[PDB]
Amino acid sequence: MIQAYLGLGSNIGDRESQLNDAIKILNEYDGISVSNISPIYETAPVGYTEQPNFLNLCVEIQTTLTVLQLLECCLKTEECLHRIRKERWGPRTLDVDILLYGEEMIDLPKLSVPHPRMNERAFVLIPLNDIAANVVEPRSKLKVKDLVFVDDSVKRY
Numbered sequence: 392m393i394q395a396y397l398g399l400g401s402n403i404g405d406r407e408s409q410l411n412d413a414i415k416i417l418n419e420y421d422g423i424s425v426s427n428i429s430p431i432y433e434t435a436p437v438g439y440t441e442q443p444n445f446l447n448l449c450v451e452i453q454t455t456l457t458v459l460q461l462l463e464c465c466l467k468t469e470e471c472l473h474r475i476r477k478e479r480w481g482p483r484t485l486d487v488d489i490l491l492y493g494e495e496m497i498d499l500p501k502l503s504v505p506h507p508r509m510n511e512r513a514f515v516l517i518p519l520n521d522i523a524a525n526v527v528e529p530r531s532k533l534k535v536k537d538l539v540f541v542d543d544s545v546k547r548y
């Protein structure tokens with residue numbers, strides 16, 4: 392049994408309903424049990440052009456799946472929520488990212504864990520700190536509470 396953390400985002404459609412449906416679907420896979428859910432935050436898009444605001448949250452799971460089995464479940468959940476993948480990036484109904492998988496570090500073509508951008512993203516760290524303040528991010532070897540920083544573009548929804 393491995394403790395893992397997922398980052399969820401939605402910036403198109405009924406964002407809150409889609410996040411709540413995603414959590415339910417994730418929890419319904421055998422080998423995944425959702426054990427904690429952060430508050431929802433409304434967040435300014437980063438890393439791209441002006442786009443609709445996201446709702447973001449983090450989920451704690453207890454899992455007996457391998458990290459690649461877990462990735463399959465995350466991507467399937469996105470498919471369930473009709474995530475579009477066009478030639479260019481755009482708004483998405485649901486994004487499910489594996490942030491942490493125990494203390495493991497994985498660097499495969501289709502999977503990087505810990506998530507490569509998480510340590511510089513308030514839309515991850517703020518909600519992650521609500522549920523995983525004392526969890527160690529294995530690359531930096533810091534607890535999440537020592538990575539989190541104040542960001543006024545991330546607000547409680």
Ligand SMILES: Nc1ncnc2c1ncn2[C@@H]1O[C@H](COP(=O)(O)CP(=O)(O)OP(=O)(O)O)[C@@H](O)[C@H]1O
Binds near residue numbers: 466487500505
């Ligand atoms: N930690 C991780 N969680 C989820 N997908 C990951 C991942 N590491 C690599 N991937 C790969 O990333 C591929 C594309 O995912 P998208 O969800 O399209 C990137 P996204 O989350 O918009 O961007 P981001 O990674 O900057 O947050 C997936 O098919 C998967 O194989």
Ligand SMILES: N#Cc1ccc(CSc2nc3c(=O)[nH]c(N)nc3[nH]2)cc1
Binds near residue numbers: 400437445482
């Ligand atoms: N629309 C759009 C769009 C915006 C940004 C990106 C780059 S990855 C990314 N994910 C998120 C996310 O869940 N939330 C926020 N606030 N910014 C993000 N940036 C990709 C597509």
Ligand SMILES: [Mg+2]
Binds near residue numbers: 486488
């Ligand atoms: Mg993402």
Ligand SMILES: [Mg+2]
Binds near residue numbers: 486487488
């Ligand atoms: Mg993703």
Ligand code: NA
Binds near residue numbers: 421
């Ligand atoms: Na389950």
Ligand code: NA
Binds near residue numbers: 498499500503
């Ligand atoms: Na790589």
